[PDB]
Amino acid sequence: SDVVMTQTPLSLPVSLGDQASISCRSSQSLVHSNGNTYLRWYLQKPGQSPKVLIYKVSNRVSGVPDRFSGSGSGTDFTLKINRVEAEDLGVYFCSQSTHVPWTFGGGTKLEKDGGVKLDETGGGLVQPGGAMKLSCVTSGFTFGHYWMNWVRQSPEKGLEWVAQFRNKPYNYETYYSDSVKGRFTISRDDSKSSVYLQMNNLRVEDTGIYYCTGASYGMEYLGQGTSVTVS
Numbered sequence: 001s002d003v004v005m006t007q008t009p010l011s012l013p014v015s016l017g018d019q020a021s022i023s024c025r026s027s028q029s030l031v032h033s034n035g036n037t038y039l040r041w042y043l044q045k046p047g048q049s050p051k052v053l054i055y056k057v058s059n060r061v062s063g064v065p066d067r068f069s070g071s072g073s074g075t076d077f078t079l080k081i082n083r084v085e086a087e088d089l090g091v092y093f094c095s096q097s098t099h100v101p102w103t104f105g106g107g108t109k110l111e112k113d114g115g116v117k118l119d120e121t122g123g124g125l126v127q128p129g130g131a132m133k134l135s136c137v138t139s140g141f142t143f144g145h146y147w148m149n150w151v152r153q154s155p156e157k158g159l160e161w162v163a164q165f166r167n168k169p170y171n172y173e174t175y176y177s178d179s180v181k182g183r184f185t186i187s188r189d190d191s192k193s194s195v196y197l198q199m200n201n202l203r204v205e206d207t208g209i210y211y212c213t214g215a216s217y218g219m220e221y222l223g224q225g226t227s228v229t230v231s
């Protein structure tokens, strides 16, 4: 039932100045009943956090050069990069947010912002069985019009969406990944423009960098992440 996002190729070697093309396919249509197709492309530079380059298939995040273009429809999507430069090098991910759970492709290795801020705190080291509360304080966007999420990253599983807390128009509904159901609880406070993640009964496999994200009208902003180690 979970939408599988498949990227090709896993690794894409290029020479500076060449054109690059990355494919992302979904296991089912990403066309939403509301008319939007919720497909994002991200770039993660080595050692840094993922940043959105393209949203709703083809919309370029302002600031991203015109050399980048997203295209496609339904289940078949493509990111094109003209005249590759050094700053473009890193891992590109696609993600779908039409269906819950939100899901990510496995990545392809190619080898401010209106004052928006999201700051994650609470990370650290705990032993299995332990608990930890992550907090995310935001500013620079009208929080009431955003769905807040927690997404995590590990070498073993890649990017994984784990929880969502919708806004008032969408009944403040919460959703969780099966991997954390019954253990993690996402909470939201509009007055403080903050979201929190209470993580109980932690396991080694919960180890990862945890990012808070704010999504609205197909766009998404992400924090720099906070590291959680369960050892």
Ligand SMILES: O=C(O)c1ccccc1-c1c2ccc(=O)cc-2oc2cc(O)ccc12
Pocket: 032, 034, 036, 038, 097, 098, 145, 146, 147, 215, 216, 217, 218, 219, 220
């Ligand atoms: O896209 C929207 O209409 C919308 C507006 C405000 C807040 C969230 C959404 C939004 C969705 C609203 C309804 C729905 O059925 C699905 C939505 O999906 C989204 C996916 C995103 O990445 C990012 C945003 C959304």
